[PDB]
Amino acid sequence: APPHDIFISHAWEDKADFVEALAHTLRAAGAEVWYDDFSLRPGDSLRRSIDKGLGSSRFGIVVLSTHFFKKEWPQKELDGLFQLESSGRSRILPIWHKVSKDEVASFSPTMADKLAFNTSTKSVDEIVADLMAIIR
Amino acid sequence: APPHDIFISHAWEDKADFVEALAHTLRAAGAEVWYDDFSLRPGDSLRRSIDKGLGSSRFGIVVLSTHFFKKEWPQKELDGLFQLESSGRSRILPIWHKVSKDEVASFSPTMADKLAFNTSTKSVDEIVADLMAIIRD
């Protein structure tokens, strides 16, 4: 089994005011979490990072915020992040964060049906409760 | 179902240089592209042009440049250029070309905040890879 339950992929701008908070709430709920090496800055490879993550984590969360999209990733990689596993199981769970639907439609990635979380419809506690349900 | 994958809305001044280069690159990558009857001139109806393009194409591209801005389109003419589909995605993909953000805001505030493709941040090839991804995925 992998040494990490979840890794949180995020743009560097979201580390201070959200990711750090989501991680702390998760760790207190019982999940083993790592994210320090998953802050994406301009220049980084998105796929390479995701691979290092699933490489030793059971699941992954990608913070889909405006800063994440502004990093201008390849639409192929982006559209890929959310393809479901041939096992039915979902390994990469997206969390939409402070974005406008109209504002990000040119890059909105093709994902599963009602597979994403949204901090606009749920608080960190609610989402962590759900994620824990998913980790067990 | 649609006989075309992509139509490219653009100001006539950009046909010669940019749009053509882009059209070639896109077709070379496997996209079915039309744009000859999509050059725009002051007065023309961006409105109807978009309807037409969307009536036979899967997606549309609009080149946002100074030339397209200097056409003075009324607000009611820009409105269709934003339409979104159930997927939350738009069938009209904008591409900023040699324009500043302040310049964009001057033309259309809403447009200046909509994330788009930018030839200032990606080569035409990179943009074409993204477009092919969008056509397929």
Q: How far is CA A131 from CA A8, A19, A22, B49, B62, in A?
A: 12, 14, 11, 47, 40
How far, in Å, CA of A23 to CA of B62, rounded? 41
Helix (H) or strand (E) holding B128: helix B124-136
CB contact under 8 A, A110 and B84: no
Identify residue B86 by its one-letter amino acid code.
Answer: S
How far, in Å, CA of A11 to CA of A106, rounded? 18
Q: Structure resolution in Å?
A: 2.5
How far, in Å, CA of A83 to CA of A85, rounded? 7
Chain A neighbors of B131, CB-CB under 8 A: 75
**B1-137 CATH pick, 3.50.50.60, 3.40.50.10140, 3.40.50.720, 3.30.420.40:** 3.40.50.10140
From its phi and psi, is residue B88 left (phi > 0), alpha (psi between -120 and 50) or beta?
left
The DSSP line for A67-80 is: HHHTT---HHHHHH
Q: A102 and chain B: CB distance < 8 Å anywhere?
A: yes
Closest residue on chain B to A76 (Cα): B133
How far, in Å, CA of A37 to CA of A16, rounded? 14
Q: B1 and chain A: CB distance < 8 Å anywhere?
A: no
Asked whether the beta carbons of B93 and B55 are under 8 A apart, the reply is: no
Q: Which two tokens stand for residue A33?
A: 């979490």
How far, in Å, CA of A37 to CA of B52, rounded? 48
Asked whether the beta carbons of B40 and B8 are under 8 A apart, the reply is: no
CB contact under 8 A, A105 and B113: no
Q: Kindly report the number of other CB atoms within 10 A of residue B125's CB atom.
A: 11
Q: Which residues contact B129 (CB under 8 A, 6 or more apart)?
A: A74, A75, A76, B29
Catalytic residues of B: 77
Nearest to A72 among B87, B88, B122 (CB): B122
Any idea what the Cα angle at residue B20 is, between residues B45 and B137, rounded to 5°?
85
Question: How many angstroms away from the CA of B131 is the closest CA of chain A?
Answer: 8
Q: Which two tokens stand for residue B53?
A: 């393009």
Q: How far is CA B3 from CA A46, B94, B125, in A?
A: 34, 21, 24
E strand intervals along B43-114: 57-64, 92-96
Nearest to A104 among B115, B118, B129 (CB): B115
Chain A neighbors of B118, CB-CB under 8 A: 72
The helix/strand/coil state of B87 is: coil
Q: How far is CA A84 from CA A13, A48, A112, B10, in A?
A: 28, 18, 7, 38
Asked whether the beta carbons of B34 and B60 are under 8 A apart, the reply is: no
B18, β-bridge pairs: none
Nearest to B93 among A70, A76, A106 (CB): A106
Q: Is B84 exposed, middle or buried (0-12, 13-18, 19+ CB in 10 A)?
A: middle
Asked whether the beta carbons of A104 and A69 are under 8 A apart, the reply is: yes
How far, in Å, CA of B74 to CA of B70, rounded? 12
Q: How far is CA A17 from CA A22, A26, A42, A72, B4, in A?
A: 9, 15, 19, 21, 45
Q: How far is CA A45 from CA A6, A57, A70, B44, B131, in A?
A: 19, 18, 14, 43, 19
How far, in Å, CA of B107 to CA of B69, rounded? 6
Q: How many CB pairs under 8 A join A and B?
A: 54
Question: How many angstroms away from the CA of A35 is the closest CA of chain B?
Answer: 26
Nearest to A106 among B90, B121, B122 (CB): B90
**In CATH, which superfamily holds the domain spanning A1-136?**
Toll/interleukin-1 receptor homology (TIR) domain (3.40.50.10140)
Closest residue on chain A to B134 (Cα): A75
Closest residue on chain B to A108 (Cα): B89
